[PDB]
């Protein structure tokens, strides 16, 4: 009774057997090739992709304006004594270091950081008056007690800021301290970049990817921009449907994820390794990519734990399914769930012997536990390991230790200047009008702040630092087009929530600009979790 009712092959497509009797398919049209039986559906994804990855001619021009980040040596002082207190600059003369305190116009020959380098993870800072304090990125705390001398100054202590500049300058250094000499030659044709890039990288030992990068495109320059270019194109190139590597959670190109069916491709692990070494290489040589993984993917890289609000980002209908079971009686409601999942079709047991354990109130929380874990890692575990190991042999993941996921995404992706007019014209208000005090204040906040907090605000709401390609008018959600939207919720004692799939900032009606600036800034900086 209907053993096979699939689609026929679209004309211009031949099924084949290879030298070992696997089955592959050949788009006679595009003169291309895939392991995965085509539907007339998936071709329009490929067409949705060929349109992306052909029209990206001018995506390049913006993506180089993107090379705003941190004027590397021009703005990265990881001096081991640490910084000069405010108003102090360092100087030299007869090859002898003098110190000027512009704060006072005196001049010492003694460095004011009085000799004993401080432990892994700690940063010295000073204050608008001058007092030295200490920032502990191993716990995101700030005591006044020096880690070495147990010492201090009377106390009235300080709130934690993240120090990205400093966490980055320590990364840059770690990368250049392990860089090898000579160069590694990457030779690719534009028509075959990928197949090409894959084979080369995957034939090198990992250390060689740490030599200088000499990329050249057969038939065409500056070595630097070609490296920018290579990473740009190749980042879009692994996204290509015919390879079966990644799918997407929501419609269009929303919420990129490892496809669990990539196993139809018998080399998929070697590609996740390849893709893995590729992202590491981009970081290690200070080049951006543009593939855009989801924030809970970066969290697995940091090996932080995947909470239930990360689940809201990647499958909004599955997360509502779990919240409902969590906040309502399920003996009251007539369904019959067990500790297993049907997903290709095979029943996998969240727990030992799950498939014959009824989900009762007694254990519905343990169910929601396992359910969340499974959702994040259904069928893509090797794929993930493959990628992480591929990454790890080129940049050891431990070098990422003091980064949160929303920093790890600015290090890969870029950091463009946000167009403030385009943002506010293409913003929609639920339970506000453009004359609402919280809304006027919100854009005063946005004009008044700086670009790094604008990026984090955007990461907090939409889930990504990448502004979409066609203005904020084309910003996308999990159900397709979904403009940035600010919505009045609760009273002034609440905290801002975010709904990443609908690009919705839930913004309580605060009684002042000062309270709003505060309550909000805290929310966009807050990262839960530890790795």
Structure tokens at 194: 């990928």
| Strand-pair category, 212-217 with 246-250 | unpaired
Q: How many CB atoms lie within 10 A of CB 456?
A: 22
Q: How many CB atoms lie within 10 A of CB 466?
A: 20
* Residue 165 neighbours by CB under 8 Å, 6+ apart: 70, 75, 76
CB 132 within 8 A of CB 88: no
The closest alpha carbon to 136, from 124, 128, 126, 127, belongs to 124
| Angle subtended at Cα 267 by Cα 264 and Cα 271, rounded to the nearest 5 degrees | 110
| Strand-pair category, 183-188 with 212-217 | parallel
Helices of type H across 413-528: 420-425, 437-448, 451-461, 513-525
Instruction: Give 16: exposed, middle or buried? Use CB within 10 Å, 0-12, 13-18, 19+.
Output: exposed
Q: How many CB atoms lie within 10 A of CB 25?
A: 18
Q: How many CB atoms lie within 10 A of CB 293?
A: 23
- Beta pairing partners, 212: 183
DSSP 3-state of 100: strand
CB 100 within 8 A of CB 87: no
Using only C-alpha atoms, the chain has a radius of gyration, in whole angstroms, of: 26
Give backbone dihedrals phi and psi of 106, rounded to 5 degrees, phi first.
Answer: -100, 180
User: d(Cα 42, Cα 165) in Å, to the nearest integer?
Assistant: 43
User: d(Cα 363, Cα 229) in Å, to the nearest integer?
Assistant: 52
Q: Crossing angle of helices 268-284/381-392, nearest 10°?
A: 40
Q: Crossing angle of helices 451-461/513-525, nearest 10°?
A: 70
Helix, strand, coil percentages (3-state) for the chain, rounded to 5, are 40, 15, 45
Structure tokens at 63: 């993506």
CB 243 within 8 A of CB 273: no
Structure tokens at 425: 């014209």
Q: Identify each DSSP E strand in 238-294 by its residue range.
A: 246-250, 254-258
For this structure, is 501 an active site residue? yes
| Angle subtended at Cα 138 by Cα 137 and Cα 142, rounded to the nearest 5 degrees | 55
Element (H, E) at 414: none
Structure tokens at 414: 């870029």
DSSP 141: B
Q: How many CB atoms lie within 10 A of CB 180?
A: 12
Task: Encode 223-247 in three state secondary structure.
Answer: HHHHHHHHHHHHHHHCCCHHHCCEE
User: d(Cα 453, Cα 446) in Å, to the nearest integer?
Assistant: 9
Q: Crossing angle of helices 316-326/364-377, nearest 10°?
A: 170
User: d(Cα 212, Cα 226) in Å, to the nearest integer?
Assistant: 13
Resolution (angstroms) stands at: 3.0
| Strand-pair category, 485-487 with 428-430 | parallel
DSSP 10: P
**DSSP letter string over 451-482?**
HHHHHHHHHHHTS-SPPPTT-GGG-EEBTEE-
**DSSP letter string over 328-340?**
S-SSSS----BSE
Catalytic position from the list 244, 255, 485, 501: 501
The closest alpha carbon to 338, from 311, 369, 364, belongs to 364
The closest alpha carbon to 62, from 471, 505, 431, belongs to 471
Structure tokens at 280: 């590491």
Q: Identify each DSSP E strand in 111-266 by its residue range.
A: 122-125, 133-136, 183-188, 212-217, 246-250, 254-258
Helices of type H across 285-419: 295-301, 308-314, 316-326, 364-377, 381-392, 405-412
**What structural domains does the chain harbor?**
13-64 (no CATH), 308-377 (3.30.2160.10), 420-525 (3.30.2410.10)
């Amino acid at each position: 009774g209907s053993e096979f009712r699939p689609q026929p092959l679209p004309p211009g497509w031949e099924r084949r057997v290879d030298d070992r009797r696997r089955v592959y398919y050949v788009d006679h049209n595009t003169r291309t090739t895939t392991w995965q039986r085509p539907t007339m559906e998936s071709v329009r994804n490929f067409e949705q992709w060929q349109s992306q990855r052909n029209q990206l001619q001018g995506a390049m021009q913006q993506f180089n304006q993107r090379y705003l980040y941190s004027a590397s040596m021009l703005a990265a002082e990881n001096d081991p004594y640490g910084p000069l207190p405010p108003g102090w600059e360092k100087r030299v003369d007869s090859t002898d270091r003098v110190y000027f305190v512009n704060h006072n116009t005196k001049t010492t020959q003694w460095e004011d950081p009085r000799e004993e380098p401080l432990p892994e993870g700690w940063e010295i800072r000073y204050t608008r008056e001058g007092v030295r304090y200490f920032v502990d990125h191993n716990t995101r705390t700030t005591t006044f007690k020096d880690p070495r001398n147990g010492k201090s100054s009377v106390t009235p202590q300080i709130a934690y800021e993240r120090g990205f500049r400093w966490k980055l300058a320590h990364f840059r250094y770690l990368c250049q301290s392990n860089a090898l000499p000579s160069h590694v030659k990457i030779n690719v044709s534009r028509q075959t970049l990928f197949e090409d890039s894959f084979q080369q990288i995957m034939a090198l030992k990992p250390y060689d990817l740490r030599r200088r990068l000499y990329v050249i495109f057969r038939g065409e320059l500056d070595y630097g921009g070609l490296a920018r270019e290579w990473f740009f194109l190749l980042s879009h190139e692994v996204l290509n449907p015919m390879y079966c590597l990644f799918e997407y959670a929501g419609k269009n190109n929303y919420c990129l994820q490892i496809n669990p069916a990539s196993t139809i491709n018998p080399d998929h692990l070697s590609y996740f390794c390849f893709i893995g070494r590729f992202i590491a290489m981009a970081l290690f040589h200070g080049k951006f990519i543009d593939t855009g993984f989801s924030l809970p993917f970066y969290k697995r890289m940091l090996s932080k734990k995947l909470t239930i609000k990360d689940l809201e980002s990647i499958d909004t209908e599955f997360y509502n399914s779990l919240i409902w079971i969590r906040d309502n009686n399920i003996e009251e409601c007539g369904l019959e769930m067990y500790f297993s999942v049907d997903m290709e079709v095979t029943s996998h047991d969240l727990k030992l012997g799950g498939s014959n354990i009824l989900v009762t109130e007694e254990n519905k929380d343990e169910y929601i536990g396992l359910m969340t874990e499974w959702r994040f890692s259904r069928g893509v575990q090797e794929q993930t390991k493959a990628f992480l190991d591929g990454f790890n042999e080129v940049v050891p993941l431990q070098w990422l230790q003091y980064f949160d996921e929303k920093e790890l995404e600015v290090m890969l992706c870029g950091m463009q200047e946000v167009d403030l007019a385009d943002w506010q014209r293409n913003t929609v208000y639920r339970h506000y009008t453009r004359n609402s005090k919280q809304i006027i204040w919100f854009w005063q906040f946005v004009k008044e702040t700086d670009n790094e907090v604008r990026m984090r605000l955007l990461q907090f709401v939409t889930g990504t630092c990448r502004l979409p390609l066609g203005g904020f008018a084309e910003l996308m959600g999990s159900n397709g087009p979904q403009k940035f939207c600010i919505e009045k919720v609760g009273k002034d004692t609440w905290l801002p929530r975010s709904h990443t799939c609908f690009n919705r900032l839930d913004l309580p009606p605060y009684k002042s600009y000062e309270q709003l600036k505060e309550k909000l800034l805290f929310a966009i900086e807050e990262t839960e979790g530890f790795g």
